[PDB]
Amino acid sequence: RRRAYLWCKEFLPAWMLFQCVLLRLMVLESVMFAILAERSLGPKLYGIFPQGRLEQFIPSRRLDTEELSLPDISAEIAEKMATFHGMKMPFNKEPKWLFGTMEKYLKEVLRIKFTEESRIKKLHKLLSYNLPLELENLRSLLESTPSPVVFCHNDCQEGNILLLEGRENSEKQKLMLIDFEYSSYNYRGFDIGNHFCEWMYDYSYEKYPFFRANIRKYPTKKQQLHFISSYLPAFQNDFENLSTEEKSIIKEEMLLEVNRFALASHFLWGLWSIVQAKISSIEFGYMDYAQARFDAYFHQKRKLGV
Amino acid sequence: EQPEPRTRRRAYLWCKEFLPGAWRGLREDEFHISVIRGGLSNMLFQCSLPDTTATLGDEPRKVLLRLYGAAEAMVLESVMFAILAERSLGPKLYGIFPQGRLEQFIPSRRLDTEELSLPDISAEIAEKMATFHGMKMPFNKEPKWLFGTMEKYLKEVLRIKFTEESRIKKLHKLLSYNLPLELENLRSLLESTPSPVVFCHNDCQEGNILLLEGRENSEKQKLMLIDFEYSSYNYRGFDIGNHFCEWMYDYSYEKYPFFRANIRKYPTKKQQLHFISSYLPAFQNDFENLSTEEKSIIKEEMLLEVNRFALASHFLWGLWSIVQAKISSIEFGYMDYAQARFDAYFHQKRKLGV
Ligand SMILES: C[N+]1(C)CCO[C@@](O)(c2ccc(-c3ccc([C@@]4(O)C[N+](C)(C)CCO4)cc3)cc2)C1
Ligand SMILES: C[N+]1(C)CCO[C@@](O)(c2ccc(-c3ccc([C@@]4(O)C[N+](C)(C)CCO4)cc3)cc2)C1
Ligand SMILES: Nc1ncnc2c1ncn2[C@@H]1O[C@H](COP(=O)(O)OP(=O)(O)O)[C@@H](O)[C@H]1O
Ligand SMILES: Nc1ncnc2c1ncn2[C@@H]1O[C@H](COP(=O)(O)OP(=O)(O)O)[C@@H](O)[C@H]1O
Ligand SMILES: [Mg+2]
Ligand SMILES: [Mg+2]
Ligand SMILES: [Mg+2]
Ligand SMILES: [Mg+2]
């Protein structure tokens, strides 16, 4: 509390996450946030200091999982993502984040020792999949799958999408993407595929494991096409003026791209969750979530026949 | 001049990975780099595509690489640089990494000391400073930087032990002034001198002002302020006062102590009025509408404000220079410079007090 009061008094000019403006308790992240603020893509930045930062509080609510599939919501998310992907940022453009992070987590996963027997058993099951071998299978598949490198959000889930208070009747301008902690140059396919995976997961469930997974909620081809139909003219300048045939070809190839990279969403966040089970103090069914993601990984492989 | 091979390799890789377009596929053997400034710290290089290499988009053909060389300040400086870039006040920011930065290369030269007094130059500096001072920045708005910094440097100065006779002798002369007491006198003076708290550059010297290539025929739009390392919320008077002091110091002198000081080069009242007459309406659009009597009152008060705060320029940078004498291995007469600043401090005090 103490430290928080003085930040407001000194940084703000009548003058964890708290509403006082908003307070968050890092060079690249700070620079990024500052740039996005300047560009009016993200919340304004009021204060930057070691113990946190003072960010604009935007009247809003986060989306619910089920809202991701509303046509107008989906269309706008696609547009916002396309816009994000268009950002120049002073960061390394060589894609490293995706597979570097997977390796990082995998290294950690392979040396984790749990004490609780339930967790020990759950880990046994997961390790049975031969994760190092599987990662190489994934690397092979994705290396064969062209995807342009863009500035990705990397965590486009409903909790990171604000529905702006008073803009609810706006068809195309009622959302803002937030929470850029994972944002980096990455394969475009990951961002979109990750988003599509998020249709399935609801993190607001009030009973253990504190999420729901619904495999039946992955977007249908029609839904996927609706999304990318919005993304593509927003991202690709010349897209709108292509022939119908040209457009179909691009779309179809993009569906293959995004659905393959979705595999990386499951793999990365599955490994992540195992690590969190060990180190996190937050109450959440991390091992159960890991299992859900790996279940989805193999299911998607079966779907794609890969 | 060409950099050493290790630097060339590292520079290559930063350019290749951080810069878009043709840079991304550039081979090592195609990389062009020349030294702007060497040394152990804050080295500068120009990095360039082959002349025969076509750009793919809107990527730069040439950039500036800044290497820090030999954590709180890191975040603030980087964030500040990014913001100023976004606002078109400063060079574009192409890359940031632990070891340095890639910045827009701006065809230009820095001003010479003598040029600070040119009326059109001075007027544009005042305007640029006014603009600077209008910036909202996500930094602490309490004006703690000035006296915080002087206190900090004084602490260190009182701790210094030199082992070389000339430095030992010089330090003793400076110490003989009773710096802690003098600092309290200065504090008391400036305490009684109203000055608005604005985002200040804090180092508006000729070396930090670029004369933009092509625009040497422009009256009002031929400069850019750079080098924001010291920038902070501070008393407006310090920024202007400090700028005035800089008329007196030329850091381009080729022989020891590698600067020249000339007290007589301080702006005349006429010159000061010219500067502030440009600043004021730049800083407040409505200013031009006040009665001449109102304007004169504001100007007269501002002159005393800036001239008082000039004392803090002398004191702060004097102390700074003593600290550098101890911690820096750069070839500069830091002690001589410290003495120069204190000489000017007492001269200015006498001017104000007579
Ligand atoms: C996208 N990632 C980074 C990887 C995939 O998992 C996540 O999407 C994610 C998001 C939210 C959670 C989450 C954790 C804890 C809670 C909770 O509210 C549950 N409890 C109420 C039980 C205790 C307090 O924290 C809610 C959501 C967990 C994982 C985060
Ligand atoms: C060419 N030599 C002889 C060797 C290489 O370094 C030099 O070029 C050189 C030139 C100028 C300086 C210099 C020293 C102090 C200042 C300063 O203005 C910096 N501050 C404004 C930060 C504090 C007051 O003194 C500016 C330039 C230092 C070294 C001098
Ligand atoms: N600028 C903001 N204005 C209003 N609410 C916000 C803002 N930023 C975040 N929130 C709310 O706080 C939640 C968590 O913040 P977020 O930036 O997503 O950090 P985390 O990484 O902890 O999820 C969001 O889901 C949203 O409910
Ligand atoms: N963006 C730029 N484009 C071209 N030259 C520059 C640029 N930035 C700095 N310089 C040159 O390098 C010198 C030192 O740069 P500066 O940013 O002032 O660093 P320092 O803190 O070392 O003085 C300047 O006086 C100027 O001549
Ligand atoms: Mg979030
Ligand atoms: Mg987050
Ligand atoms: Mg400089
Ligand atoms: Mg500097």
CSV table of C-alpha atoms in Angstrom, one decimal, chain A residues 26-28 30-31 48-51, chain B residues 68 71-79 96 98 139:
chain,number,residue,atom,x,y,z
A,26,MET,CA,11.6,-5.5,-18.0
A,27,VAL,CA,13.3,-3.1,-20.5
A,28,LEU,CA,11.7,-4.7,-23.6
A,30,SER,CA,8.4,-1.4,-20.9
A,31,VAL,CA,9.5,-0.1,-24.2
A,48,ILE,CA,7.1,3.7,-15.1
A,49,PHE,CA,9.2,2.6,-12.1
A,50,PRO,CA,10.9,-0.6,-10.8
A,51,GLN,CA,8.2,-2.0,-8.6
B,68,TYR,CA,27.2,1.3,-24.0
B,71,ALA,CA,19.0,-1.0,-14.4
B,72,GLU,CA,16.6,1.8,-13.3
B,73,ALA,CA,18.2,4.3,-15.6
B,74,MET,CA,18.3,1.7,-18.4
B,75,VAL,CA,14.5,1.3,-18.4
B,76,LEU,CA,13.8,5.0,-18.1
B,77,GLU,CA,16.4,6.1,-20.8
B,78,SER,CA,15.1,3.4,-23.2
B,79,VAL,CA,11.5,4.2,-22.6
B,96,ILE,CA,17.3,-2.2,-28.4
B,98,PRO,CA,21.5,-5.2,-23.5
B,139,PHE,CA,8.3,9.8,-15.1
